[PDB]
From Swiss-Prot, chain B:
Expressed in keratinocytes and hair follicles. This is Transient receptor potential cation channel subfamily V member 3. Residues 43-68 dip into the membrane without crossing it. Na(+) binds at G60. It is found in: Cell membrane; Cytoplasm; Lysosome. It comes from Mus musculus (Mouse). Signal peptide: none annotated. Homotetramer. May convert from a homotetramer to a homopentamer to allow pore dilation. Interacts with TRPV1; may form a heteromeric channel with TRPV1. Interacts with SNX11; this interaction promotes TRPV3 trafficking from the cell membrane to lysosome for degradation. Residues 31-42, 69-71 are extracellular. Belongs to the transient receptor (TC 1.A.4) family. TrpV subfamily. TRPV3 sub-subfamily. The chain crosses the membrane at residues 1-30, 72-108. The gene is Trpv3. Non-selective calcium permeant cation channel. It is activated by innocuous (warm) temperatures and shows an increased response at noxious temperatures greater than 39 degrees Celsius. Activation exhibits an outward rectification. The channel pore can dilate to provide permeability to larger cations. May associate with TRPV1 and may modulate its activity. Is a negative regulator of hair growth and cycling: TRPV3-coupled signaling suppresses keratinocyte proliferation in hair follicles and induces apoptosis and premature hair follicle regression (catagen). It comes from the Eukaryota. The chain holds residues 579 to 693 of 791 of the full protein.
């Protein structure tokens, strides 16, 4: 207070390298201004001291383009570390400004403070902004949640959908769903104007487009299976039944054309969705675009099985059979329309990545290790000239140890071995390590994976269904998006229409008299 | 027994029949005509025979024979080992892990449901 | 304290910071700089690093008697000090140890299988 | 603990002129005639707020 009254510059910009750090441990970024330094270090008396000065420009921008409200989003952390002072500094600065000037300002990346919190994954600030309700009369216009009516326990609220719905680019709903960086997407979609907004899209148009997507992919596989199982089978003649080469004048030949034209609709479309999404990360491949590759690998093998018939290499039959078996295992994509089977396909993905791959790494070490030891211990089979041993080669000993683990076949210790006790010592040791140890420990480790993913498998499923809803919406044309549009225009104040969304609520605990309502008459008017 | 059937066993049988009838047509479409040996050249000669031989391989009965009448012998063994990993290693061992979660919740309530 | 496994006294000594001015020299942890939330500290490595004999890091690792060795290595000047050794030289010596033991087995297998 | 025993047994093996090159730490003037070869760790803390005394260096940034 001595320095400000003596004439200190209250608009200085600390723009050094230490204040614009390259890595997170080299410096401290706060917003380059002394108003942002007092706010980011929890000093509310100096914030009130600086905002009373008339020389303080509250809408100034630093070198990144950030203003005071962009900088508080950058330094925000969880309740565990930074308890809650950043959410209370955001409210105090915004009410004294009294405008929408700071909320609607774009930095050098093109983001407002609302779109910057969704980009970085700040779920505690974003919960505050989307549900901001101000009760006082002159500052009620700065809200994003309005009470339409109330009567006793029952009330009816309105949530603003200005930059959170997909009517514009870089909306809040599109940043949260398609964000590869952050690791709490499935917790940020439980927020309230976003949770009802995805439920409204699934009832109006999205469940009907998910059923036409199932029916034309089921008919595609059931007409690929029948033409490949019912081929003309001759040793002298191998006609490809597709493209209808023989002039048999047999109608329903459009099923043979439905495999050609629909293999090109999938290989072109799934090539675009791989091209537009460059993951540059093997974890992002397995977690978001597994079904983009495996719908693309199938549709290529159907096309290559027709180009190899025109060149007659007789390996087209190896490409059709790989396309048939891969295609019926791609019907497990469509279990996300249902909650019961959709949460079951999240368990299958977590068990393979955590438990089954570690088992197969140690098992093949023991399979190929005892396979060479037992094969090197068997004599030459000239004395009986045929069938003296089943462990005569490396390829035969590996096959006989694989049958012994799945339980098939028959065990015979009367081999052609020189050392019959040493053969039985190595064959019982293989049983103890795999039948007793490794296969019984896989069941004990899956019970630990299932116990942790059961807490989270419903929220992970709804993130997988939300990506399906949005990709249907970019497809259908502009005159369909006006008919299936969410919300209704609501006169909030004098000359203010915001296109809100209505949610009802019953509350029995906090009793109070009702003011700050928009409508006196509580009932639904038309 | 009533809670395990409704929650756990019906979801298992839905995914298992998708894999049983899926690999059953792929392996049956890969076997040649049996005129050269005139009898018993393959046990995967039809769709009805390949589905039966994959069901016996899961419950543990029978005997495994890879010397079929297949044109592509490496591709037959790739599809037959992949069937074992998906069912013997994944689905049957995960049914035991999911029943242990159902039993843990119904044990709190099974006396009041009985009365 | 490292010989007997006293993990509460040893946490005190390795991180001893004295704030007063005439007795600051008896510390083993010094604040180099600080600015708001961010700070930077310095941990003394006089008898805890392996430049001498009977160091603290060598007593904790090679102690057969005590039963809390894996809890005493989470202490802070010891946790960063093992992470620094693995990046500089130790992960590269663990990869040459793998390659010449893999080639040893793969040339013992081939000469015994192809006799 | 099993990896730490592997790290240390590699260190007794390599010679004396390699241990000078891969040596940890840096000499720091703590007080008048006191050099202790310390090791630096950074930290961010948001809960205990206080004014800062007892620092060794006034200028916070990394000097070289
Ligand atoms: C089946 C076994 C085959 C096995 C073969 C291998 C397959 C392997 C695995 C397979 C996985 C299981 C099969 C996938 C099926 C998914 C399809 C789907 O989305 O279902 C959905 C409904 O679906 C509907 O749309 C209802 C049907 C009405 C007619 C639709 C025709 C649209 C044209 C008319 C358009 C113009 C008129 C429209 C006016 C606006 C179910 O969604 P839901 O979540 O249950 O809904 C909420 C209900 N709840 C509240 C209780 C939760
Ligand atoms: C191109 C490779 C195809 C398979 C080849 C096998 C070897 C390659 C090795 C593959 C490594 C296996 C790791 C899979 C990683 C995740 C598993 C998974 O998605 O779970 C899914 C179950 O789907 C399954 O059943 C997975 C089993 C894999 C093969 C399926 C049988 C196909 C037959 C093949 C024979 C012909 C082979 C012809 C081609 C060589 C469901 O889980 P999710 O919740 O939906 O997770 C996706 C998340 N996402 C939706 C947002 C994206
Ligand atoms: C550290 C403590 C644990 C380790 C201890 C050892 C440490 C290091 C030692 C290592 C190996 C020392 C033996 C090398 C030579 C023996 C091989 C041999 O001649 O075959 C012998 C088998 O005998 C075996 O099976 C030996 C296999 C290892 C047994 C060691 C105990 C394992 C514990 C399991 C305990 C119960 C199992 C006992 C074994 C069944 C018999 O020979 P033959 O087959 O009859 O050939 C006859 C030839 N003829 C037909 C032409 C006439
Ligand atoms: C994305 C990453 C994962 C997917 C990668 C691929 C992505 C997309 C690709 C898809 C398929 C590409 C190959 C199509 C044509 C090959 C078919 C063929 O000719 O048969 C070949 C078998 O070869 C196979 O078994 C291929 C099966 C798929 C292997 C792909 C790796 C799976 C991972 C598992 C890795 C370990 C397993 C390796 C395979 C055992 C050999 O032919 P044959 O039987 O000897 O016939 C001889 C004919 N004759 C007798 C008349 C003289
Ligand atoms: C034009 C009139 C319709 C009649 C013909 C329909 C022809 C097409 C019907 C079905 C295609 C079958 C899909 C199987 C193969 C997948 C690849 C593919 O090419 O399909 C694509 C088209 O799929 C759809 O978009 C389905 C919805 C129908 C869109 C057409 C109506 C638009 C108007 C709206 C009004 C509707 C009702 C509103 C309610 C009143 C996308 O399929 P996918 O599953 O999303 O992609 C795979 C998933 N993956 C991305 C993770 C890999
Ligand atoms: C037992 C006496 C003898 C048999 C009876 C006689 C035959 C019975 C005939 C029909 C009954 C078959 C079951 C349907 C109802 C199941 C209940 C359910 O929760 O389903 C759920 C998913 O379940 C699915 O629907 C998965 C899709 C698999 C194919 C079945 C399609 C059903 C259409 C029928 C065509 C016939 C197919 C089958 C016929 C061979 C519904 O989805 P959800 O609501 O979003 O999730 C619920 C989770 N929640 C409760 C917490 C919200
Ligand atoms: C389908 C069968 C053929 C597939 C093979 C194709 C190769 C590519 C395979 C898989 C693709 C990439 C692996 C998974 C990607 C990361 C996800 C993950 O969680 O990894 C996990 C598994 O990772 C392992 O450590 C596996 C063990 C060795 C793998 C050897 C190949 C597979 C063995 C079969 C063939 C062996 C023969 C060849 C070997 C030279 C790491 O464990 P985690 O603890 O869960 O870490 C996550 C951290 N978390 C818990 C905090 C979340
Ligand atoms: C889900 C799974 C995904 C991955 C797929 C893998 C799954 C399946 C993997 C493998 C199945 C392979 C079966 C045999 C096929 C070819 C035979 C062959 O090449 O052997 C040749 C060389 O063999 C030798 O000379 C000895 C072996 C050398 C390597 C030592 C093995 C130890 C590796 C342990 C650590 C490695 C693993 C570490 C941990 C990962 C000789 O062939 P033959 O038998 O002598 O033929 C004689 C007949 N003839 C005379 C008529 C010509
Ligand atoms: C016996 C064998 C033959 C029976 C078949 C006769 C058909 C009728 C079958 C059963 C009768 C009706 C189903 C159960 C009724 C509701 C109770 C329930 O909990 O449902 C559960 C299972 O529901 C499923 O999703 C099953 C998976 C698909 C079923 C496909 C047919 C059965 C598979 C075999 C044949 C496949 C071949 C045909 C498929 C086209 C839903 O899961 P949930 O999470 O527990 O939801 C409860 C909510 N809760 C947890 C909060 C409590
Ligand atoms: C608990 C269970 C409750 C439910 C009961 C179910 C349990 C059992 C279910 C089924 C058992 C069936 C066994 C065989 C019975 C009849 C054979 C037949 O009709 O095939 C005929 C057509 O076959 C074809 O042409 C190819 C198959 C077409 C469909 C593709 C299957 C993939 C479905 C995957 C997704 C579907 C499931 C999705 C998930 C649910 C041909 O017969 P054939 O062999 O060629 O005869 C030749 C001999 N002859 C020349 C002398 C004339
Ligand atoms: C219980 C727990 C189960 C765990 C399973 C463990 C996994 C591995 C388990 C077992 C693998 C080994 C067992 C059989 C292989 C050898 C058989 C043999 O006799 O050799 C054969 C050769 O065949 C080959 O050369 C190809 C071998 C690889 C097949 C596919 C690899 C795995 C597929 C990955 C699946 C994708 C994963 C996707 C799933 C999500 C025959 O050749 P031959 O006898 O020498 O004589 C023929 C004449 N010749 C020489 C002229 C040619
Ligand atoms: C001279 C130049 C190198 C070229 C030739 C290398 C020849 C040797 C290479 C590899 C040996 C292979 C080991 C397999 C057999 C184990 C037994 C054995 O005798 O090995 C011993 C040597 O092993 C090592 O120490 C590996 C590290 C290389 C040391 C040589 C470089 C020294 C300079 C440093 C600069 C390096 C780079 C710094 C980064 C810039 C120890 O192996 P172990 O696994 O520890 O013992 C088993 C574990 N157990 C104790 C629990 C039982
Ligand atoms: Na058995
Ligand atoms: Na048997
Ligand atoms: Na269990």
């Amino acid at each position: 207070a001595v320095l400000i009254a003596a004439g200190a510059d209250v608009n200085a910009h600390a723009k050094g390298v230490f204040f614009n750090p390259k890595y997170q441990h080299e410096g401290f970024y706060f917003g380059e201004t002394p108003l942002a330094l007092a706010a980011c270090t929890n000093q509310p008396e100096i914030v009130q001291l600086l905002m009373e000065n008339e020389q303080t420009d509250i809408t100034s921008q630093d070198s990144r383009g950030n203003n005071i409200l962009h900088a508080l989003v950058t330094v925000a952390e969880d309740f565990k570390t930074q308890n809650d002072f950043v959410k209370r500094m955001y409210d105090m600065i915004l009410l004294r400004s009294g405008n929408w000037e700071l909320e609607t300002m774009r930095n050098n990346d093109g983001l407002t403070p609302l779109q910057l919190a969704a980009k970085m994954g700040k779920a505690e600030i974003l919960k505050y902004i989307l549900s901001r309700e101000i009760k006082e009369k002159p500052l009620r216009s700065l809200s994003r949640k309005f009470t339409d009516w109330a009567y006793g326990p029952v009330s009816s609220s309105l949530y603003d959908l200005t930059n959170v719905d997909t009517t514009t680019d870089n909306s809040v709903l599109e940043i949260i769903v398609y964000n590869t960086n952050i690791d709490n997407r499935h917790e940020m979609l439980t927020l309230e104007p976003l949770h009802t907004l995805l439920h409204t899209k699934w009832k109006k148009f999205a469940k009907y487009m998910f059923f036409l997507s199932f029916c034309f992919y089921f008919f595609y596989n059931i007409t690929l299976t029948l033409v490949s199982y019912y081929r003309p089978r001759e040793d002298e003649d191998l006609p490809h039944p597709l493209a209808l080469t023989h002039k048999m004048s047999w109608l329903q030949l459009l099923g043979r054309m439905f495999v050609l034209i629909w293999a090109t609709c999938i290989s072109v479309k799934e090539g675009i969705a791989i091209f537009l999404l460059r993951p540059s990360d093997l974890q992002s491949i397995l977690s978001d675009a597994w079904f983009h590759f495996v719908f693309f690998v199938q549709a290529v093998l159907v096309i290559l099985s027709v180009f190899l018939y025109l060149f007659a290499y007789k390996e087209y039959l190896a490409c059709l059979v790989l396309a048939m078996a891969l295609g019926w295992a791609n019907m497990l994509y469509y279990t996300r329309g249902f909650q019961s089977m959709g949460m079951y396909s999240v368990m299958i993905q977590k068990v393979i990545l955590h438990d089954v791959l570690k088992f197969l790494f140690v098992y093949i070490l023991f399979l190929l290790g005892f396979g060479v030891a037992l094969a090197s211990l068997i004599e030459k089979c000239s004395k009986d000239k045929k069938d003296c041993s089943s462990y005569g080669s490396f390829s035969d000993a590996v096959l006989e140890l694989f049958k012994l683990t799945i339980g098939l076949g028959d065990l015979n210790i009367q081999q052609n071995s020189t050392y019959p006790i040493l053969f039985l010592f190595l064959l019982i040791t293989y049983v103890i390590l795999t039948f007793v140890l490794l296969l019984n420990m896989l069941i004990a480790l899956m019970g630990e994976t299932v116990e942790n993913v059961s807490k989270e498998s419903e929220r992970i499923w709804r993130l997988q269904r939300a990506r399906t809803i949005l990709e249907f919406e970019k497809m259908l044309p502009e005159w369909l998006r006006s008919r299936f549009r969410m919300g209704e225009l609501c006169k909030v104040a004098d000359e203010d229409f915001r296109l809100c969304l209505r949610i009802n609520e019953v509350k029995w605990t906090e009793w109070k008299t009702h003011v700050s309502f928009l409508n006196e008459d509580p009932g639904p008017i038309r």
